């Protein structure tokens, strides 16, 4: 473990989904040629060019591991739609297998369909408003509380999970950012609301383990 040039990055699985050269959404490298993000990211596809940037820590600094990849195909869950929070997953296939290294490496995702224990501190990372990749450990909430914190609209299914969150988070945070617990991908954020108000809201993430068969079916 020594390459005088290429530097190691703490979160080598983070991918930046870009549109016309600017950060659109965070994503996670889950296989050499696949990046998982949220379907709502490709919402207002300005019809521009969409690419995936890997090996980046900071989007405003030169780094030897940064590499741009084009997208061969974008596969949103078949049941996702703009007016629902459900099945908000999106798999992007890169133009070619990503060259892996100290700054580029796939992250294992949870295939065992069981809830993350409430209270567990999970790593949420992404590029907010962007510069250096931002990350915070947020505690997972029990579904009961989350349901009541969402004003009880039964919006939280067993295919979704919740984490604590502050205001900036719910308005200035990465719109496709993963939720990683114990080094395993567990969730993908469902929010993208850019309107910053005083309305505090918990963080809602799509549980990847809940869509294991689908992810498997797509990557096969």
Curated annotation (Swiss-Prot):
Effect of residue 195 to A: Abolished ability to cleave CFB
Stored SMART domains: Tryp_SPc (SM00020)
Modifications after synthesis and translation: CFD is activated by the removal of 5 residues at the N-terminus, named activation peptide, by the MASP-3 isoform of MASP1.
Catalytic residues in the record: 40 (charge relay system), 88 (charge relay system), 175 (charge relay system)
Cysteines engaged in disulfide bonds, as pairs: 25-41, 122-181, 146-162, 171-196
Listed Pfam families: Trypsin
Record-linked InterPro entries: Peptidase_S1_PA, Peptidase_S1_PA_chymotrypsin, Peptidase_S1A, Trypsin_dom, TRYPSIN_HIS, TRYPSIN_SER
GO MF term set: serine-type endopeptidase activity; serine-type peptidase activity
Entry-linked PROSITE patterns: TRYPSIN_DOM, TRYPSIN_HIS, TRYPSIN_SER
Effect on the protein of changing residue 194 to G: Abolished ability to cleave CFB
Region (Self-inhibitor loop): 190-194
Catalytic reactions of this protein: Selective cleavage of Arg-|-Lys bond in complement factor B when in complex with complement subcomponent C3b or with cobra venom factor
Disease: Complement factor D deficiency: An immunologic disorder characterized by increased susceptibility to bacterial infections, particularly Neisseria infections, due to a defect in the alternative complement pathway.
Protein name: Complement factor D
